[PDB]
């Protein structure tokens, strides 16, 4: 791991940094880079809803093409599925030999949606927390750990430059892990699909369905598989499985140890491996890009179905009771 003493802040301080996009990460990076003495400009199309906010924070904003021409380091933090078009239309025609093209995730480069030219460095700085936390920790003199990767390095200083950037957003205060674009994106997609945004939600829905079908009230079903999951995951986030299991009752702990491996069995793990294979072979990403090109039809259909699940109906009613939410 790399820490503050492994990174030289004067490197990034000597580079003009363009941040393309002003979502959570673009906001956190741009403000922290500026605080660290870096000359920053934000790249947004002229009609962007974010332009007035960038300007209110005292930052200069230009189009992505203008920022790419001006900058020595172009950090791309636009939405995943929008990056290829920004690259082809705005960034690629304006890259200069010896520029560095930075990303917050490995997807676009790894899967060939963006094919950088040979005359630029290509690197990634990926903080392991939401932008609000990246910024809050930085302002308080601390940091959020980051992943860094260097995919192309024709000037030989790509890692030093990426570590300098990480230091300028606080990442080396906590620690930086070096990885690859391939590993970052394949593990990210895999975790999203099997656990974060697929598996856990389907597990909650399935438990809810079983209870309602058995004639238990939907309100109790909501509490006992969804509402109560926040405490569990908060405990794991802070102290791992050990902390959570110590905190819950012996009845919950014993029940979890016996029933968990029945719910998630060897066959479930084999299906995970199938989902990983379809990430690794490019087929999932091909399907995603095709759906985007067609107007997000399948995404929008599946979105509506999940939004209409009965857990959503009862959950809205119960969350209306909760004055801290």
Q: Does 172 bind Na ion (CB under 5 A)?
A: no
Comparing CB distances to a copy of itself, the nearer of 88 and 263 is 263
Comparing CB distances to Na ion, the nearer of 59 and 71 is 71
Rounded to 5°, the CA angle 221-226-229 comes to 130
Q: Tell me the C-alpha to C-alpha distance, in Å, between residue 133 and each of 5, 7, 28, 188.
A: 23, 22, 8, 19
Q: Minimum CB separation from a copy of itself for residue 281, in Å?
A: 13
- Contact partner, 198, from Mg ion, Cl ion, Na ion, none, Cβ < 5-8 Å per class: none
Phi and psi (nearest 5°) for 105? -150, 165
Q: Does 283 bind a copy of itself (CB under 8 A)?
A: no
Whole-angstrom distance, CA of residue 320 vs CA of residue 318:
5
State which of residues 254, 281, 282, 297 lies at the interface with a copy of itself (CB under 8 A): 254
Q: Does 37 bind a copy of itself (CB under 8 A)?
A: no
Phi and psi (nearest 5°) for 149? -140, 150
Closest CA to 97 of 118, 67, 128: 118
93-152 residues in contact with Na ion (CB under 5 A) are 94, 99
Q: Does 175 bind a copy of itself (CB under 8 A)?
A: yes
Q: What letter would DSSP give residue 80?
A: G
Q: Tell me the C-alpha to C-alpha distance, in Å, between residue 110 and each of 100, 149, 150, 284.
A: 16, 12, 12, 13
From 11-19, 46-54, 69-77, 170-178, span contacting a copy of itself (CB under 8 A): 170-178
- Among candidate residues 27, 29, 105, 110, the one labeled active-site is 105
117-136 residues in contact with Cl ion (CB under 5 A) are 130-131
Percent of residues in the chain assigned helix, strand, coil, to nearest 5: 60, 10, 25
From 28-36, 169-177, 227-235, 311-319, span contacting Mg ion (CB under 5 A): 227-235
187-246 residues in contact with a copy of itself (CB under 8 A) are 187-207, 209-211, 214, 216-217, 219-221, 223-234, 236-242, 244-245
From 68-76, 104-112, 233-241, 280-288, span contacting Na ion (CB under 5 A): 68-76
81-120 residues in contact with Mg ion (CB under 5 A) are 117
Q: 105 catalytic, yes or no?
A: yes
Q: Tell me the C-alpha to C-alpha distance, in Å, between residue 248 and each of 66, 87, 228, 258, 325.
A: 55, 49, 11, 15, 23
Sort 227 into a burial class: Cβ within 10 Å, 0-12 / 13-18 / 19+. middle
Comparing CB distances to Cl ion, the nearer of 170 and 199 is 170
CB 88 within 8 A of CB 124: no
Whole-angstrom distance, CA of residue 323 vs CA of residue 306:
25
Comparing CB distances to Cl ion, the nearer of 113 and 126 is 126
Q: Which residues bind Mg ion (CB under 5 A)?
A: 60, 62, 117, 188, 224, 228, 250, 282
Residues marked as catalytic = 105
């Amino acid at each position: 791991m790399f820490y503050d003493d492994d990174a030289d802040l004067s490197i990034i301080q000597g580079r003009k940094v363009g941040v393309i996009g002003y979502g959570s990460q673009g906001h956190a990076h741009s403000l922290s880079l500026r605080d660290s003495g870096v000359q920053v400009r934000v790249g947004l199309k002229q009609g962007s809803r974010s332009r007035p906010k960038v300007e209110e924070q005292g930052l200069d904003v230009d189009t992505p093409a203008e920022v790419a021409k001006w900058a020595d380091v172009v950090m791309v933090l636009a939405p995943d599925t929008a990056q290829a078009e920004i690259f082809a239309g705005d960034i690629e025609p304006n890259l200069k030999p010896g520029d560095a093209l930075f990303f917050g995730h490995g997807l676009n480069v790894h899967f060939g949606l963006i094919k950088p030219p040979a005359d630029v460095a290509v690197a990634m700085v990926a903080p392991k927390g939401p932008g609000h936390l990246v910024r809050r920790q930085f302002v308080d003199g601390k940091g959020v750990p980051c992943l860094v990767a260097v995919e192309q390095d024709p000037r030989g200083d790509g890692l030093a430059l990426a570590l300098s950037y990480a230091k300028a957003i606080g990442g080396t205060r906590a620690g930086v892990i070096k990885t690859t674009f391939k590993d970052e994106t394949e593990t990210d997609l895999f975790g999203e699909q099997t656990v974060l945004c697929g598996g856990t939600e389907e597990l909650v829905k399935a438990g809810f369905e079983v209870m309602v079908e058995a004639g238990y009230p939907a309100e109790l079903a909501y509490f006992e598989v969804l509402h109560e999951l926040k405490l569990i995951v908060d405990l794991m986030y802070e102290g791992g499985l050990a902390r959570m299991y110590y905190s819950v009752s012996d009845t919950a702990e014993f029940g979890g140890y016996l029933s968990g491996p029945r719910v998630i069995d060897a066959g479930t793990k084999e299906r995970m491996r199938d989902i990983l294979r379809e990430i690794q072979d490019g087929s999932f990403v091909h399907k995603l890009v095709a759906d985007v090109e067609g107007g997000n039809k399948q995404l929008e259909e599946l979105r509506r179905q999940n939004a209409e699940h009965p857990i959503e109906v009862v959950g809205k009613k119960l969350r209306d009771l909760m004055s801290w939410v």
